[PDB]
Design a protein around this ligand. Structure first.
Ligand SMILES: *[C@@H]1O[C@H](CO)[C@@H](O[C@@H]2O[C@H](CO)[C@@H](O[C@@H]3O[C@H](CO)[C@@H](O)[C@H](O[C@H]4O[C@H](CO)[C@@H](O)[C@H](O)[C@@H]4O)[C@@H]3O)[C@H](O)[C@H]2NC(C)=O)[C@H](O)[C@H]1NC(C)=O
Ligand SMILES: *[C@@H]1O[C@H](CO)[C@@H](O[C@@H]2O[C@H](CO)[C@@H](O[C@@H]3O[C@H](CO)[C@@H](O)[C@H](O)[C@@H]3O)[C@H](O)[C@H]2NC(C)=O)[C@H](O)[C@H]1NC(C)=O
Ligand SMILES: *[C@@H]1O[C@H](CO)[C@@H](O[C@@H]2O[C@H](CO)[C@@H](O[C@@H]3O[C@H](CO)[C@@H](O)[C@H](O)[C@@H]3O)[C@H](O)[C@H]2NC(C)=O)[C@H](O)[C@H]1NC(C)=O
Ligand SMILES: *[C@@H]1O[C@H](CO)[C@@H](O[C@@H]2O[C@H](CO)[C@@H](O[C@@H]3O[C@H](CO)[C@@H](O)[C@H](O)[C@@H]3O)[C@H](O)[C@H]2NC(C)=O)[C@H](O)[C@H]1NC(C)=O
Ligand SMILES: *[C@@H]1O[C@H](CO)[C@@H](O[C@@H]2O[C@H](CO)[C@@H](O)[C@H](O)[C@H]2NC(C)=O)[C@H](O)[C@H]1NC(C)=O
Ligand SMILES: *[C@@H]1O[C@H](CO)[C@@H](O[C@@H]2O[C@H](CO)[C@@H](O)[C@H](O)[C@H]2NC(C)=O)[C@H](O)[C@H]1NC(C)=O
Ligand SMILES: CC(=O)N[C@@H]1[C@@H](O)[C@H](O)[C@@H](CO)O[C@H]1O
Ligand SMILES: CC(=O)N[C@@H]1[C@@H](O)[C@H](O)[C@@H](CO)O[C@H]1O
Ligand SMILES: CC(=O)N[C@@H]1[C@@H](O)[C@H](O)[C@@H](CO)O[C@H]1O
Ligand SMILES: *[C@@H]1O[C@H](CO)[C@@H](O)[C@H](O)[C@H]1NC(C)=O
Ligand SMILES: OC[C@H]1O[C@@H](O)[C@@H](O)[C@@H](O)[C@@H]1O
Ligand SMILES: OC[C@H]1O[C@@H](O)[C@@H](O)[C@@H](O)[C@@H]1O
Ligand SMILES: OC[C@H]1O[C@@H](O)[C@H](O)[C@@H](O)[C@@H]1O
Ligand SMILES: OC[C@H]1O[C@H](O)[C@@H](O)[C@@H](O)[C@@H]1O
Length: 836
């Protein structure tokens, strides 16, 4: 069995780090004036359903700070009205456009701010996408680390310039939604452990988080799963050794809802804030809260650690926002209802006022949502069918093309299929302000165009369909979908995770039938991820296939732009379209197989998605980074310019000893509930109810000093040595990792008749017997006019060419023959040269 090695003590903030020096100072000037009670309020959630947002902290009224509001989603504001619904992160990734990564972020952030949210619970790098059938991979960006890391840095930078606090979501493992928690139909004693060896962790799953740390993300969420059999929220090597030690993360770490299962041990493991605060939803008891105060008071949790917890939360707050002000606008919505009036303490039915204000907060974001959705559509196949000109008879076919007869928001958290699919289910959702359905957008295009339009919005009226598409001169566009979501909603026996990689609602045989009766058949797929196209992609009557992903509120208008050439395709697949499911290598584990704790050995190593296909030459139908245009592009004249140099010297030194900020009284009666006080039911408070700390806690396991149940040095205050693989005041790793060793340029020439975008992609091969054949390392999206030639330049950093040595515990550049390639895809590599 795998074990998680201990890394202690929990690193405290560096006052000279990166872009936090000022935010550190302002936090220092603020937490210094906090009582122990107030520190426990900022770190402990009020309990599930306790307030307005999906998570809220204790307030600090004496210092003028209201409760902090934390809320979903990574694609728009969840559970409220007059928000926008942006396209998924997966689809956004498919644009391969950093500008759009950022614009979507700043967009989402501005809406969260307008509602009064202080922490937006996004963007997502866990799951990265280890298995195509994973329930939530669509919330992320790509199974590929470089594209995902770029998308994260850019989305985080957007969210926070708005500016609310961004949250790098689900720290590592959690590539699957089965067994993420316990119970729920299965007999497992603990959550699944995904076990990841050290090299895999550094150059695959942690890679994007590094990028989020280096971009300045204010918070990080730990995940429900264990890693080497200790929950990510109790994990020393992960939270202390990797995130806060090596990458030097300066912000605060919050828990996934009910992901914390221990109090003090979790605090020194690295957890700064527990959410929504209970031990368990509606239980009224906390592993922190009252337990947190008696932990300091009885000596076993060092004072410096709770000050660090406070320092991190308040530093994040001050890093965004950018003024020393606290003092926020009111939280103007409520998550638990849409009613205008209701209990502000929803769970307890206490505090009946106006909790919903219906603030339009939408701006003109529909322009951006429609642009991203179109520029993120992938044109998979095009045998002379597209763009559509003025078809005499256009016939749209499929349920996915129509309205949910029950309305766009009929199902809470999007937990059902019906009509068009524009969004997966789970927390990663928002309500649509409207949902432009393809039927309506295409019909209106055809009418303006003078065409004849008929639609059959069913997957099963077969003879009805036949009569429609058999007629002379028919252009048939057929809409099919596949879905997944978070594990707490089962839609048609899919327990969050996809059961299989085929289309839902019999889309396969719907396509096979339409292609059977019509010679110009176009397939559009709305889906959470790849679907096996094997039985029908090469049909001679299917003349084009497009993947439009999860486009959000403007899905209809976006696919019309692409079909009629208003927007020229360019979108590249953020994943591989394989022929079998075994061809992807790793797979979801749907059954614990009598095991008490399901174990997931990540023995595929760094070989997920296209890396796996390329290594074992399993069959690929559309490769990673594939996408077509209505024009053509000629790559010529490769140039690699090598910068000298600067030797990679280690890092190096010794930190400052753990500080204290403010003081705490030792008169236990100071922490009793104030005399008049009224306890909202099940609300999580910081006050003790007995001057007997053992009784105050009510923990039946009470009474051991830190040396009896915490590992060595777990509370140590002494200066700690600096890790070889970090930078001194440089969060993200040894800053020489990001020196540019090579500049790579080619000449990209549009050779078609229509203007368009091109997604030049940069791949490297690091020699190496255990290495992939190609790894993506840079990319660029260029706009080129028909006659034009354009200079693409890419960069390769010292990290870009490195392997993680575990003996050395750093990054090295081994002495293997190494090469760089430029391609139109993972496989369509047209230029290559030796890196000298
Ligand atoms: C000071 O106050 C704090 C706050 O309440 C109080 O903390 C609690 O401490 C106990 C230790 O006494 C913690 O409980 C243990 O937790 C660890 C990690 O989860 C377990 O390994 C421990 O196992 C013991 O007993 C088991 C049963 O035989 C064995 O299997 C095991 O090997 C161990 O012997 C035990 O479960 C508890 O988590 C915290 N509570 C919170 C909310 O943090 C502390 O005890 C007080 N200190 C003093 C000196 O009074
Ligand atoms: C999950 O477990 C794996 C393996 O138990 C952890 O990976 C291992 O990480 C340690 C460092 O944390 C590596 O240690 C080094 O060992 C070399 C000898 O090979 C030694 O010379 C060095 O001094 C160094 O200590 C270890 O090699 C590595 N093992 C593998 C197979 O990669 C992993 O970090 C664990 N993850 C978590 C979150 O606990
Ligand atoms: C820790 O956080 C909690 C929750 O945010 C804080 O509790 C809030 O405290 C105020 C007063 O301290 C309570 O106000 C009272 O309402 C009555 C009428 O019901 C009114 O007469 C009072 O003047 C006051 O407005 C408020 O209800 C309470 N919130 C809850 C949910 O109970 C607490 O103060 C924080 N502790 C510290 C040390 O900052
Ligand atoms: C802190 O703890 C004390 C006791 O540990 C709490 O006080 C007590 O509350 C219980 C009920 O919650 C009272 O007991 C029983 O209550 C019913 C309903 O009133 C009563 O009719 C029965 O005859 C029976 O006594 C108990 O009398 C009461 N004792 C005292 C001294 O208050 C206290 O409420 C807790 N404080 C907070 C802020 O939660
Ligand atoms: C502090 O944490 C402990 C557990 O770490 C909480 O303990 C519960 O106490 C009840 C009392 O009957 C037991 O039945 C449970 O087994 C205990 N553990 C749980 C619920 O996980 C304790 O309530 C916490 N203190 C406060 C004030 O919430
Ligand atoms: C491609 O589409 C055409 C229809 O446009 C299919 O052809 C018809 O085929 C049936 C039986 O094969 C004949 O009875 C009809 O007279 C044909 N009509 C026309 C207009 O050709 C053709 O079979 C389709 N191809 C495939 C592989 O299914
Ligand atoms: C099957 C068939 O012949 N369809 C014809 C097509 O050839 C022609 O281009 C179009 C407009 O003239 O009218 C229709
Ligand atoms: C052949 C087969 O198993 N098809 C089903 C499909 O009907 C269903 O919609 C989907 C849900 O994930 O699971 C699969
Ligand atoms: C488990 C662990 O790291 N313990 C450390 C030890 O290595 C170090 O020598 C000591 C200072 O003398 O501080 C403590
Ligand atoms: C301790 O606190 C209580 C209430 O907060 C107060 O009434 C009492 O006088 C204090 N005692 C000492 C010795 O400070
Ligand atoms: O294909 C048979 C059935 O598969 C499953 C569901 O998605 C249904 O909509 C469908 O009828
Ligand atoms: O580079 C030296 C270091 O090698 C590796 C680390 O895990 C340490 O055990 C050691 O100090
Ligand atoms: O609902 C709010 C939170 O709790 C859970 O539902 C999800 O796992 C989280 O990702 C989410 O941020
Ligand atoms: O802290 C609570 C935690 O510790 C104990 C174990 O038996 C676990 O099952 C439980 O979740």
């Amino acid at each position: 069995w795998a074990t998680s090695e201990p890394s202690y003590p929990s690193p405290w903030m560096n006052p000279n780090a990166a872009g936090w020096e000022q935010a550190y100072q302002w936090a220092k000037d603020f937490v210094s004036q906090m009582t122990l009670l107030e520190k426990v309020n900022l770190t402990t959630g009020v309990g599930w359903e306790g307030e307005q947002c999906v998570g809220q902290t204790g307030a600090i009224p004496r210092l003028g700070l209201r409760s902090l509001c934390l809320h979903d989603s990574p694609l728009g504001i969840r559970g409220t009205d007059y928000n926008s619904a942006f396209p998924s992160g997966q689809t956004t990734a498919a644009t391969w456009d950093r500008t759009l990564f950022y614009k979507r972020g700043y967009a989402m952030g501005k809406e969260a701010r307008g509602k009064g949210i202080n922490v937006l619970l996004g963007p997502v790098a866990g799951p990265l996408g280890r298995m195509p059938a994973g329930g939530r991979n669509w919330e992320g960006f790509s199974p590929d680390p470089v594209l995902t890391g770029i998308a994260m840095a850019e989305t985080v930078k957007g969210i926070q310039d708005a500016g609310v606090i961004a949250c790098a979501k689900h720290l590592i493992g959690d590539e699957q939604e089965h067994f993420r928690q316990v119970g729920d139909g299965f007999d497992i004693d603990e959550s699944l452990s995904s076990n990841i060896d050290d090299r895999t962790m550094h150059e695959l799953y942690l890679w994007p988080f590094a990028d989020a740390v280096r971009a300045g993300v204010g918070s990080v969420m730990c995940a429900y799963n264990q890693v080497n059999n200790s929950y990510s929220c109790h994990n020393s090597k992960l939270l202390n050794g990797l995130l806060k030690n090596e990458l030097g993360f300066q912000g605060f770490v919050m828990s996934d809802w009910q992901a914390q299962h221990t109090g003090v041990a979790s605090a020194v493991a690295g957890l700064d804030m527990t959410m929504p605060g209970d031990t368990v939803f509606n239980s009224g008891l906390s592993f922190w809260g009252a337990n947190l105060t008696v932990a300091v008071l009885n000596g076993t949790l060092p004072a410096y650690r709770l000050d660090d917890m406070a320092m991190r939360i308040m530093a994040a707050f001050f890093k965004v926002r950018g003024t020393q002000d606290v003092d926020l606008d009111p939280i103007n919505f409520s998550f638990w209802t849409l009613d205008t009036y209701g209990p502000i303490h929803w769970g307890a039915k206490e505090g009946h006022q106006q909790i919903n204000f219906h603030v339009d907060v939408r701006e003109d974001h529909s322009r951006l949502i429609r642009e991203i959705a179109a520029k993120g559509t992938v044109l998979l196949k095009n045998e002379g069918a597209l763009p559509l000109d003025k078809p005499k008879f256009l016939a749209v076919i499929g349920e996915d093309a129509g309205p949910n007869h029950n309305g766009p928001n009929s199902c809470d958290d999007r937990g059902c299929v019906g009509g068009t699919l524009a969004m997966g289910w789970g927390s990663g959702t928002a309500n649509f302000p409207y949902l432009v359905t393809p039927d309506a957008a295409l019909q209106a295009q055809a009418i303006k165009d003078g065409s004849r339009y008929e639609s059959v919005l069913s997957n099963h009226a077969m003879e009805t369909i036949r009569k429609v598409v058999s007629q002379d001169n028919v252009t048939a566009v057929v809409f099919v979908n596949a879905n997944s979501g978070e594990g707490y909603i089962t839609v048609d026996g899919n327990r969050g995770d996809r059961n299989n990689l085929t289309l839902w609602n019999g889309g396969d045989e719907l396509i096979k039938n339409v292609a059977s009766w019509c010679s110009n058949t176009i397939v559009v797929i709305h889906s959470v991820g790849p679907v096996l196209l094997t039985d029908w992609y090469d049909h001679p009557n299917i003349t084009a296939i497009l993947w439009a992903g999860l486009p959000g509120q403007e899905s209809g208008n976006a696919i019309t732009d692409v079909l009629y050439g208003k927007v020229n395709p360019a979108g590249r697949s953020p994943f591989t379209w394989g022929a079998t499911r075994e061809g992807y290598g790793a797979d979801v584990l749907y059954d614990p197989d009598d095991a008490r704790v399901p174990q997931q050995n990540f023995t595929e190593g760094v070989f997920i998605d296209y890396r796996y296909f390329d290594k074992h030459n399993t069959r690929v139908i559309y490769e990673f980074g594939h996408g077509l245009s209505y024009t053509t592009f000629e790559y010529r004249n490769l140039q690699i310019q090598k910068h000298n140099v600067s030797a990679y010297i280690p890092t190096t030194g010794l930190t400052e000893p753990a500080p204290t900020f403010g003081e705490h009284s030792t008169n236990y009666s100071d922490y009793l509930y104030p005399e008049g006080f009224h306890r909202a039911n099940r609300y999580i408070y910081p006050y003790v109810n007995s001057t007997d700390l053992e009784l105050a806690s009510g923990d039946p396991y009470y009474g051991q000093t830190a040396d009896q149940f915490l590992p060595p040095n777990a509370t140590s205050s002494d200066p700690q040595p600096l890790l070889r693989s970090s930078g001194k005041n440089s969060p993200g790793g040894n800053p020489q990792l990001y020196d540019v060793l090579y500049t790579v340029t080619a000449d990209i020439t549009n050779t078609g008749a229509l203007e368009g975008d091109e997604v030049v992609q940069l791949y490297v091969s690091l020699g190496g017997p255990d290495d992939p054949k190609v790894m993506l390392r840079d990319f660029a999206r260029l706009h080129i006019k028909p006659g034009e030639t354009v200079k693409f330049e890419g960069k390769l950093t010292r990290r870009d060419l490195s392997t993680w040595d575990v003996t050395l515990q750093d990054w090295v550049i081994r002495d293997h023959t190494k090469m760089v390639f430029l391609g139109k895809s993972s496989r369509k590599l047209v230029l290559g040269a030796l890196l000298n």
